[PDB]
Design a protein around this ligand. Structure first.
Ligand SMILES: NC(=O)c1ccc[n+]([C@@H]2O[C@H](COP(=O)([O-])OP(=O)(O)OC[C@H]3O[C@@H](n4cnc5c(N)ncnc54)[C@H](OP(=O)(O)O)[C@@H]3O)[C@@H](O)[C@H]2O)c1
Ligand SMILES: NC(=O)c1ccc[n+]([C@@H]2O[C@H](COP(=O)([O-])OP(=O)(O)OC[C@H]3O[C@@H](n4cnc5c(N)ncnc54)[C@H](OP(=O)(O)O)[C@@H]3O)[C@@H](O)[C@H]2O)c1
Ligand SMILES: O=C[C@H](O)[C@H](O)COP(=O)(O)O
Lengths: 474, 474, 474
């Protein structure tokens, strides 16, 4: 309906070519976003680097004021933005509004976290007596221009989680939203524009990653790449970054380890909520159940009953299971479902597909020779893998190339901590689904699941460097 | 002339083929080191990953005890090791012994720093009231297998500065010393072996980086690359690293900014010591003087007087200026000198070369069109560049692709801090030469000078990750 | 003139007796505050300890919301409150409004500082191998009921500087303002009540020292005493506190050391502003100049010219010099002036007194046998003491029983740092007047100038304790 524009050096810019966005659940035309050229990318980066000097010389309190204003505007327009976001990525209406609200919360928290940045004073006399009068005054500085790249499934939340930590520290930022999700990304940018963010301090880039993706990453003007998306794309970003710093939040295949002494009802509740939330289109979703044989039959039945209770419908109706982001995703999920069936897996809930609306499929008796045991579906399908020992569960869990998070369901917490030490993941939730929040907590993935540590204070630290001034007291 | 061996899984192994090492100053045959094959590299990494489990489960004090033992052995054998190191890299005998002692100091300091590793407890109620009973127990863990690569100019010191921080945190390590310097690196390995370091926890790799260099870095078994060397090789390591974390300490072109109110005698003393130490083969060396014109004539004269008193001779005689590491290095330095001369630079001290022993050359009236104004010589040649304003000095300093350190000589310390904020370097020393110490201080380079922050406590943090355990209080 | 009430368990209470409050500059009747009995104090403390359980179990975000709301209300009523504050303690009208604004900023900053207080996870294996599986989860908790006692010269700012840090951490608070200043304190309490602070979480106490003075401190319900006032009164509070924690902000006699290379005009500007602000009725004020004799004549002349131009008049006219707080204070200041004159000091500005309005008196050639060299006047009188060495200045400065802050005026900052290390004070300001701000900086006094460390984050730590939970991983 509307022709959207990029925020470039404090002004709204059209491009010669544009990309029409459609609602994945209905095909409704939502608008268009610019298809930037390489020359327009250069202008965005040139504007950012020119604004950096005056921006980093502002006080922390002044930079924090801008972020607070943008958060206030997001809360004001949460219904407006969430309504469009719901259509753009086929997310439940209420869930879409919640994302906008959560984004404002992260921006506010990042502003107050970052303005309290402190330095250190180190003593030369800690290392050698002859240097006892030498001290080091170590203060934090920005890294420069941060390229922020958000994913389709949380195009606003996982944009703000990068923009706010970067800006408070004195960096300038360019946001590359996902094409499917660029409208919501540009709506987020409108809030920062209305808040008065100085020209060039924050800008947006839109275009198909397959066309301009490598160019925006390879560009020498960029000092830092903060990316959330698929593991293959993250792999390429790692190569193109060279020796420049990066943060990557990539794929996940979070395991849920259920021991013999677990509250099976509580486990089934958390497993189903985490696995099928947003139709399973989340990196921190429960994506495989590793359950001890003794309790597998009872756990599978309780999970099944809850899966049968999930609603399947449209975003406007706040259905639990909504249509997937596009046809390719549904075809990929259907293939994984077909593979499990052909190899003897027991489908405890039935596969059905209407367009790209896939019903929630629960598989039992999944074996490691099935693709569904390892590949990230990003769809509403959950495998149950039976194990005989906790060592096997740890073994199978760590054999995955992914290591984002894991859940352990048990009443023996000392043992759970011991298991957690052996799991090659960033975060382990006890008797709870895997999840990124609360946003002050650390969020990181091991192995192919990412690089660097996020969460608010951790993001700020990652996107800063240090400047040491050393002198001798006389 | 001994046949030296690599430390592999608690055993000392020769290889089918070996590399003969010669003292660069005299041609004396010092011994041979193995020329490992790719399969032998695979065996090293396999051994390390197998030892990781038992090593990381030990207590901090147990791991610290091994490091203290190794440091004690280094101090005991400082003269023996220093004598060979002096010959192998043409470093002054006394300075070579000092390197070994400093290495023991770093190992001891890293052991006591790392054993005090602490985690953090985060409150869910800091972010949202509904999560006030949720807490995150965040503990530190090793990253896994660290590949340490040291340079020829400090093959023992800049090996220990990587090994000890990694080991205390629970990482396993493979050390790839420089070929010219590998004997010294294997002598360091002997100390760790005699200290009883468990088999596979620490290993060595030798071989020409031009044949196995890419292979040891690209190997998927490596979780972390900690490298010190040239910028082009560091640039390639960043690409081959992919998404994996790295630390790079690359080239330097440190500027010495001398203002009109400077103590010229103090500036000349620090500039000469820092520029010509080890014949200028140091990354943190003063490599260009940016001096206000008003004081340039007198500074240049006082620097000249000190340069003329530097001793030029052999490493065994503890000469200030020793022969460069190889003929190519000397040819490169002579090339830079010719470029400056042809373009009109004033040679305050004459260029003379006997073999690869180059006399110390001081140039005045160097211009930005000369290669010596920018390229890292790694030889005993120092340019003086006159400026008319401090702004110009800052601009010329930041025009360099390097940004390791900088010195400011002035009596106005508030203004010196303001200049320091604008310099694109890791560390700024006031009224003192640039230097890495004290080793507890942060050490880092901006732009093409590196990635990550070293210094003991910073090295430990860089080579650890975090493991978060989240649960709800009831 | 209205009859004011105490906030007690969410209700506003009069007492059978009251205390009428008059403007020190005019005798104007401003209103009355209750003269509480010991039994009414018991009710205040009982209500606070009754509310503690529900208050400390709220989330940090919930507690922060109350403080932010209260700060907003103070900004709204800054003109209303400041107008009364100006009359109550004879502070300049504009300065009084500024105090209210500064209080709001401190309340906001404390709220966001406190909600981010983090805990620690400690490793048993850091100390002994046998305990390597034992970890300590250390979290912050409030100390309980904090008694906050504010001073007459900052009855709102130095109340909020205690209330807000205490409340965010989960403490409950009882505010005892000074009698002269009690109205302004109760006006501050109205803001917290309007913000919805739960009943009993924050309360006020007013009354006569002859009835409740020692009683409010001795009461066993009080877990923490946070006091700003005179040193003798602080001494007594320490005794009555027993083993309970306290914070004391007492008197000062800040030295301003002026070296031969100092900018005398800048030094004179800062010395005069710091010494005569609010007629010198501040503990953190330049109260004695220690100047090298070579520059003393020129410095004294620069100070003299500035002192002569200070305005002397009424709070309503924003005069530089306003009437002192009461007659006894003015008599005490006159006595110090007479002693200095009788012992031979040179009066560079004339002494005049109308009522309790004393004109600013500058003395030169002050010797350390004069009372004015040591005793805190709390009036507009400044001595200049000439020295011949820096060592003499340090000795004379440290001979004082006070050690709050000090100023050093010089262009040699390395030397200034060396001097600062030897000065027995909390804070040393270089080329600037002594001052408490910025409020995130530490504020503390050595020797008889106080106990504990204030500034926002330091005040929160002081008014919290830790709770350690230790268990073994299995
Ligand atoms: N770990 C986490 O925190 C987290 C959170 C959310 C999602 N994810 C992961 O993200 C994936 C799903 O999201 P997605 O489908 O949007 O991922 P994607 O296809 O990798 O795209 C992610 C972002 O990268 C951009 N991009 C694509 N090609 C690029 C290139 N060559 N160079 C630079 N940027 C390029 C895309 O732009 P276009 O939209 O124009 O292609 C988009 O904005 C899943 O694997 C999921 O696990 C991870
Ligand atoms: N910033 C610092 O802390 C610091 C300190 C010292 C030196 N440096 C820098 O290091 C440079 C001089 O040292 P250098 O001559 O030893 O540097 P270099 O030629 O880059 O070699 C450094 C190390 O890398 C190895 N290497 C070579 N090719 C490799 C490859 N393709 N892949 C992986 N590793 C490879 C070398 O082994 P071989 O010997 O077998 O080639 C050696 O052990 C200067 O630029 C100096 O500024 C920096
Ligand atoms: O891609 C989705 C990520 O997992 C995201 O963090 C989901 O949000 P949550 O886990 O915080 O609920």
């Amino acid at each position: 309906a509307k022709q959207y524009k990029n925020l470039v050096n404090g002004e709204w810019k059209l491009s010669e070519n544009e990309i029409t966005i459609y609602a994945p659940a209905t095909g409704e035309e939502l608008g268009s976003v610019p298809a930037m050229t390489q020359a327009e990318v250069d202008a965005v980066y040139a504007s950012a680097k020119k604004a950096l000097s005056d921006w980093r010389t502002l006080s922390y309190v002044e930079r924090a004021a801008y972020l607070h204003k943008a958060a206030d505007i997001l809360v004001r327009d949460a219904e407006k933005i969430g309504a469009i976001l719901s259509k753009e990525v086929a997310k439940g209406h209420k869930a879409a509004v919640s994302e906008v609200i959560r984004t404002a919360e992260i921006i506010n928290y990042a502003a107050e976290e970052g303005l309290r940045m402190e330095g250190e004073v180190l003593e030369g006399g800690s290392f050698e007596a002859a240097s006892k009068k030498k001290i080091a005054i170590v203060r934090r500085e920005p890294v420069g221009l941060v390229l922020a790249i958000s994913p389709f499934n949380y195009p606003v939340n996982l944009a703000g989680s990068k923009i706010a930590p970067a800006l408070i520290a004195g960096n300038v930022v360019a946001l590359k939203p996902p094409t499917q999700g660029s409208i919501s990304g540009l709506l987020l940018a409108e809030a920062f524009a209305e808040a008065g963010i100085p020209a060039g301090v924050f800008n947006t880039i839109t275009g198909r990653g397959s066309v301009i993706g490598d160019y925006i990453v390879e560009h020498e003007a960029v000092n830092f790449i903060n990316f959330t998306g698929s593991t293959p794309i993250g792999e390429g970003i790692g190569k193109l970054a060279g020796m420049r710093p990066i943060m990557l939040e990539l794929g996940g295949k979070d395991s849920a380890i259920v021991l013999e002494d677990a509250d099976l009802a509580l486990a089934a509740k958390n497993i189903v909520a985490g696995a099928f939330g947003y139709s399973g289109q989340r990196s921190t979703a429960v994506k495989r159940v590793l359950v001890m044989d003794k309790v597998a039959d009872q756990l599978a039945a309780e999970i099944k009953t809850l899966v049968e209770k999930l609603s399947v419908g449209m975003p406007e109706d706040d259905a639990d299971i909504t249509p997937l982001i596009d046809t390719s995703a549904a075809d990929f999920v259907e293939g994984l479902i077909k593979d499990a069936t052909d190899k003897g897996a027991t489908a405890l809930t039935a596969f059905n597909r209407e367009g790209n609306l896939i019903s929630p499929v629960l598989f039992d008796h999944v074996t490691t020779d099935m693709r569904l045991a390892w590949e990230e579906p990003f769809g509403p399908v959950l495998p149950i893998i039976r194990v005989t020992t906790v060592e096997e569960a740890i073994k199978i869990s760590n054999e995955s190339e992914y290591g984002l998070q894991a859940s352990i369901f048990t009443t023996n917490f000392p043992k759970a901590f011991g298991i957690a030490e052996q799991l090659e993941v960033g975060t382990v939730h006890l008797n709870n689904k895997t999840q990124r929040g609360t946003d002050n907590f650390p969020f990181l993935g091991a192995k192919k699941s990412g690089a660097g540590v996020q969460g608010v204070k951790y993001s700020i630290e990652a996107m800063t460097t240090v400047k040491s001034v050393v002198f001798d007291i006389q």
